[PDB]
Design a protein around this nucleic acid. Structure first.
Ligand SMILES: [Cl-]
Ligand SMILES: [Cl-]
Ligand SMILES: [Cl-]
Ligand SMILES: [Cl-]
Ligand SMILES: [K+]
Ligand SMILES: [Mg+2]
Ligand SMILES: [Mg+2]
Ligand SMILES: [Mg+2]
Ligand SMILES: [Mg+2]
Ligand SMILES: [Mg+2]
Ligand SMILES: [Mg+2]
Ligand SMILES: [Mg+2]
Ligand SMILES: [Mg+2]
Ligand SMILES: [Mg+2]
Ligand SMILES: [Mg+2]
Ligand SMILES: [Mg+2]
Ligand SMILES: [Mg+2]
Ligand SMILES: [Mg+2]
Ligand SMILES: [Mg+2]
Ligand SMILES: [Mg+2]
Ligand SMILES: [Mg+2]
Ligand SMILES: [Mg+2]
Ligand SMILES: [Mg+2]
Ligand SMILES: [Mg+2]
Ligand SMILES: [Mg+2]
Ligand SMILES: [Mg+2]
Ligand SMILES: [Mg+2]
Ligand SMILES: [Mg+2]
Ligand code: NA
Ligand code: NA
Ligand code: NA
Ligand code: NA
Ligand code: NA
Ligand code: NA
Ligand code: NA
Ligand code: NA
Ligand code: NA
Ligand code: NA
Ligand code: NA
Ligand code: NA
Ligand code: NA
Ligand code: NA
Ligand code: NA
Ligand code: NA
Ligand code: NA
Ligand code: NA
Ligand code: NA
Ligand code: NA
Lengths: 95, 160, 92, 186
RNA sequence: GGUUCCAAUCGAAACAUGUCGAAGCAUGACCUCCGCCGAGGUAGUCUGUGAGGUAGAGCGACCGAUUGGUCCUGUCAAACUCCAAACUUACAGACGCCGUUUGACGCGGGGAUUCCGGUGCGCGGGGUAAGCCUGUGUACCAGGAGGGGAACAACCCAGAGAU
RNA sequence: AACACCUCGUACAAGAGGACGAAGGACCUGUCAACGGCGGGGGUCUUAAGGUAGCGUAGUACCUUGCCGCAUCAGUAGCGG
RNA sequence: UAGCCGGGCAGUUUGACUGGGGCGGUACGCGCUCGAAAAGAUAUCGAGCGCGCCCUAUGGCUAUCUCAGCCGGGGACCCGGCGAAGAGUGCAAGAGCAAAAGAUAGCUUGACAGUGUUCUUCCCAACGAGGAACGCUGACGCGAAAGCGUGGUCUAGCGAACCAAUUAGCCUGCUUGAUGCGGGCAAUUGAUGACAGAAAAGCUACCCUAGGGAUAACAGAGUCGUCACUCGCAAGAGCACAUAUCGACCGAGUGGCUUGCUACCUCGAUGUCGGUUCCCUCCAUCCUGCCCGUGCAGAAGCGGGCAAGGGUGAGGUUGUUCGCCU
RNA sequence: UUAGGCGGCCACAGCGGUGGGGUUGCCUCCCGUACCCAUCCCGAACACGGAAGAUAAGCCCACCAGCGUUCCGGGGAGUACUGGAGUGCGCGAGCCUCUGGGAAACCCGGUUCGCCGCCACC
């Protein structure tokens, strides 16, 4: 990498496909999750806030409470545990 | 310089003119020869020159072989004979040269070349059954001035 | 950049929003009686004098803002974090 | 439309029926909405909650089935509106609903409007709704006073289909009292 | 440059962050030893729920290149994409293997060595090239005998207590 | 600049400021048989001036075995211009 | 005792990176695309290019509204139509945004104080400053209200300890009280760009030591762009005639004499260039033997084939190799 | 849903087009400014009050595939590319066999002129 900012090499994963352009449906942004629940992490290009670090895109954590409207989701990066703050706009129920 | 320096495809595609400046002009005078106003389907016979190996051909070679083939068709059919040949390739790959030692070695722009996969037709001529032996000879001279071995192939022509 | 000489904002002293006046922190004179002033005299003699032989550093291309926010009613001042600015001029 | 790369708006956006930016902000409260909608002739009030496959309406009222309790006058006016809100508000209290947030759709927040009248009614019915008193029309205009004074400038009878001549804000009062009773069919 | 007896168990790193640092150190990674915890673990495969735009392809799908003729006709892309793999990867179940006297997974502490690497294969970037320079994944040499290859660190077979 | 003196400060002192002002410096002048300099452009510019007698391919000239002549069968040498 | 001058003398410093070192440059702190091999991570003096600010509005909320561009009617203005985004949004690049994140208008100062959770900085996996997301307490702005405002749509715009100045309150100074003047808890501002922070110029051929083939000159070795020689095609000219002879372009090669590249071998030493003497060899043949063609009358040539038995000498300038001259 | 309101998926729903339907019912157009409210100028819009008229717009219903989109058949194609293995071939750039996966363009033919949830209503 020529630089080391968070948006490095994120051209593909943080860009909307043309037909999905524009504002997203409020339904998933207001969704409610319970503790112990398994969720998939994926940033919505259209939603600016409630984002996590792009490296974590593609993970599958476990909801373990919340901090404000946002959620606290547990994950394991490589072999190290980490707790990620993220909104429902960037989350999906597993299974 | 020798073609040995650029004949193989051993580098990424370097064709983006938006990041490359000072690219030399092509030596290829014309791509559509003979009677460009007439149609390709207006001829009984159609022979193409097929490249046998996957290679890179510099604009210098394209001009030399195109020249020495059409020059024959003009000599045997006339400056306005009944035929039409086609050089169906354009030189897109830009070439460098490290012309200090290996320090800051990225080369400067020295030329252009067309990439041709084995099995592709470089040239394609269209003529009547009479002139069929002239087009073959014109192609014989043409494959003498480019790197790979070539197959002179007559596509629509069962008048052999 | 421009900045209003007076405006409304939180006064940490009254604990309620009030009009504050903005001024540029002037340098207070040195009494020359602090501990550092005494060590200079004590430790300086024949030859090199360590730290007391060094001279003034340098300059950054742009300095941050050095301001004093004064409350219009209780009259007390508070400081804030500064921001790099090539020039600052108050309005009115 | 034009090609593959083309963007077609969400259906309710093409239909000019849903303000999605306002809808989201509305949903953030976590409370059920009080859907205040009007028509040229009528008024409507729904209590909507969120659901897996689409909104769930828990209670509602229409200015048409208002007469079912005593109405005999027009339904596209102020008195009509308030009463429809109170009605809907009461059916809501009956379903176990306690609070709501006013959703006025693509209408304008003009002071003293019908959506606000609808809102006042539901508040009077016993629902906890975020409001602002000094935006609701004055009590008299809700009753239908402004309309009585209009026909006061008679010359040519206001109401075609006879309900009366000078009209009756009193009928409004009779209706309010009829609904405030606890027995009433809801 | 040198540092003197025998044997048994385990067995590296030639890399990352900071350094007047690059012939050196510290902190991690990795090797080893001790104590603690007490039931799961996941090197392989299958399936389910997710992540992705490289190969290839195509471009009247954007974008920028690139032909000729009186719609048709000729061509491209590391810093293009209407498309799109193999494959890599998160979580979970199932089978396999493994652990509950060989205590796994994990936690805490003592001790290091190490931070000149090299080669084959796959994918690379630079360079006319190189027994070149610089990445990456993997196995090997280094520290790997014995059989084969005329000889021969890394190519083939093969990992080896004695008889 | 320091001492002395004056103001403020301190029951005193530390300290702050002031008045006066030596050599030195700014400023001006003299000096190159003092260090050194003597160009580019055009028919002035840098930075003061812009190479005079002489000598010159030099033990100093890259181009260079410069060109002409002497001398030799032939002279990157040598001497003369 | 104070100010000026002061290499006469003393002690020291004068960085690192780097296809050896110096010169050049900064890949020495940061952001984006590509390189990067469709998770994450990834080098080179790798390709394209940026940041060390600017803004009191170019910040914030609300209301009202929809832009480029093209068409039609009266490249300023007015009316209508087409027009999902090509406009605009401070500045690189990539990404976001249309009843808005854009435009206009009006209002407002949340660019607010206090204290945290988390991620990043530093993938995995320890490490500061800095940064971001998301909360809580306090006080406010706007809106009918949900709600939005912890600066600018997102990723660059940054700085330790010591010391000083500054902000508000409080602790403290040797038996004790009063005064003066000090020491401290929290925090803001002042620079170290060699950017996880020393206060810092050169020469040595008079030289010296420790080491290194971890690294250059010379020789060897790899390569062969350069150099030497060859071949294919044969445009062309040669009074006509391509091929007696000369022979462009383009294409394919062989050698290892030149040159360049690389850094494998040697720095506890493989003695330099040129010359000389004396020995062996190669053929891409200068002569000599034997041949073929000719633009071969002859004679003298010119070009080509086989062929390494023998021969290939003397002198003038210059150290010259080379080369010029008799 | 014999015309309604709030939605989920967010073009299978877009673009364009044909036919049909409403007396005190519904939705509209519609009619009109004393009031609440409104236009940097206009009751155009926003807002309020109301039914003389209309089904021509919108809307709801049935339907057409020319463009765009979704999926599917056959063909392209087990082609291009590719994960594991080889004392297989080639001077070499490179190719081939075995094993496990597997495309895009394009042509032809079907499909698609939205589906689903809640509430109210002849
Ligand atoms: Cl995060
Ligand atoms: Cl300031
Ligand atoms: Cl409505
Ligand atoms: Cl083993
Ligand atoms: K040596
Ligand atoms: Mg990519
Ligand atoms: Mg001293
Ligand atoms: Mg031992
Ligand atoms: Mg033993
Ligand atoms: Mg490709
Ligand atoms: Mg990968
Ligand atoms: Mg070793
Ligand atoms: Mg002379
Ligand atoms: Mg000295
Ligand atoms: Mg010393
Ligand atoms: Mg160095
Ligand atoms: Mg990646
Ligand atoms: Mg922001
Ligand atoms: Mg210091
Ligand atoms: Mg200060
Ligand atoms: Mg540093
Ligand atoms: Mg750093
Ligand atoms: Mg020595
Ligand atoms: Mg070496
Ligand atoms: Mg010897
Ligand atoms: Mg021979
Ligand atoms: Mg011999
Ligand atoms: Mg009709
Ligand atoms: Na969207
Ligand atoms: Na250099
Ligand atoms: Na050839
Ligand atoms: Na002392
Ligand atoms: Na290393
Ligand atoms: Na180091
Ligand atoms: Na060292
Ligand atoms: Na490939
Ligand atoms: Na091994
Ligand atoms: Na052997
Ligand atoms: Na230094
Ligand atoms: Na931090
Ligand atoms: Na060499
Ligand atoms: Na060679
Ligand atoms: Na030796
Ligand atoms: Na010699
Ligand atoms: Na011979
Ligand atoms: Na000589
Ligand atoms: Na105005
Ligand atoms: Na309609």
């Amino acid at each position: 990498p020529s630089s080391n900012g968070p948006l490095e090499g994120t051209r593909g994963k943080l860009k909307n496909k043309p037909r999905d352009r524009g504002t997203s449906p409020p339904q998933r942004a207001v969704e409610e999750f319970d503790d112990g629940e398994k969720v998939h992490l994926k940033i919505d290009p259209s939603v600016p806030n409630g984002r996590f670090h792009p490296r974590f895109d593609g993970q599958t954590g476990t909801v373990e409470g919340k901090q404000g409207d946002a959620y606290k989701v547990d994950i394991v990066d490589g072999g190290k545990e980490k707790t990620i703050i993220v909104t429902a706009a960037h989350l999906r129920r597993q299974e | 310089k020798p073609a040995s320096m650029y004949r193989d495809i051993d580098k990424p595609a370097y064709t983006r003119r938006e990041y490359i400046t000072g690219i030399p002009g092509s030596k290829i005078a014309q791509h559509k020869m003979g009677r460009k106003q007439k149609d390709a389907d207006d001829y009984p016979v159609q022979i193409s020159l097929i490249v046998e190996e996957t290679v890179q051909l510099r604009h210098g070679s394209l001009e030399a072989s195109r020249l020495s083939a059409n020059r024959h068709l003009i000599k045997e059919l006339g400056e306005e004979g009944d035929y039409k040949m086609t050089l169906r390739k354009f030189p897109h790959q830009v070439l460098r040269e490290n012309k200090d030692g290996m320090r800051a070695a990225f080369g400067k722009i020295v030329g252009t070349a067309a990439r041709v996969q084995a099995g592709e037709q470089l040239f394609t001529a269209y003529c009547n059954v009479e002139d069929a032996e002239h087009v073959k000879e014109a192609f014989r001279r043409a494959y003498n001035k480019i790197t790979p071995s070539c197959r002179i192939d007559s596509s629509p022509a069962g008048n052999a | 950049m421009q900045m209003p000489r007076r405006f409304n904002t939180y006064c940490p002293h009254c604990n309620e929003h009030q009009e504050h006046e903005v001024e540029k922190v002037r340098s207070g004179r040195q009494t020359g009686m602090k501990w550092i002033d005494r060590q200079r005299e004590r430790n300086s003699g024949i030859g090199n004098d360590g730290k007391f032989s060094k001279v003034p550093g340098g300059d950054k291309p742009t300095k941050k803002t050095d301001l004093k926010y004064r409350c219009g009613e209780c009259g007390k001042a508070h400081l804030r974090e500064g921001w790099r600015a090539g020039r600052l001029e108050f309005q009115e | 439309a034009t090609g593959p790369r083309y963007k077609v708006p969400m259906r309710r956006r093409r239909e000019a029926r849903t303000d999605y930016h306002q809808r989201l902000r509305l949903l953030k409260s976590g409370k059920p909405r009080l859907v205040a909608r009007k028509s040229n002739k009528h008024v409507r009030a729904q209590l909507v909650t969120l659901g897996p496959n689409g909104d769930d309406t828990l209670a509602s009222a229409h200015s048409s089935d208002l007469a079912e309790y005593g109405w005999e006058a027009p339904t596209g006016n102020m008195p009509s509106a308030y009463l429809t809100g109170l009605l809907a508000g009461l059916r809501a209290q009956e379903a176990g609903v306690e609070e709501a947030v006013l959703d006025i759709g693509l209408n304008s927040p003009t002071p003293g409007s019908k959506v606000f009248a609808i809102q006042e009614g539901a508040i009077d019915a016993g629902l906890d709704i975020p409001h602002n008193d000094d935006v609701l029309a004055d009590w008299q205009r809700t009753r239908g006073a402004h309309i009585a004074e209009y026909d006061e400038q008679l010359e040519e009878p206001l109401y075609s289909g006879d309900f009366d001549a000078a009209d009756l804000p009193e009928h409004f009062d009779e209706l309010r009292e009829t609904l405030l009773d606890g027995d009433i069919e809801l």
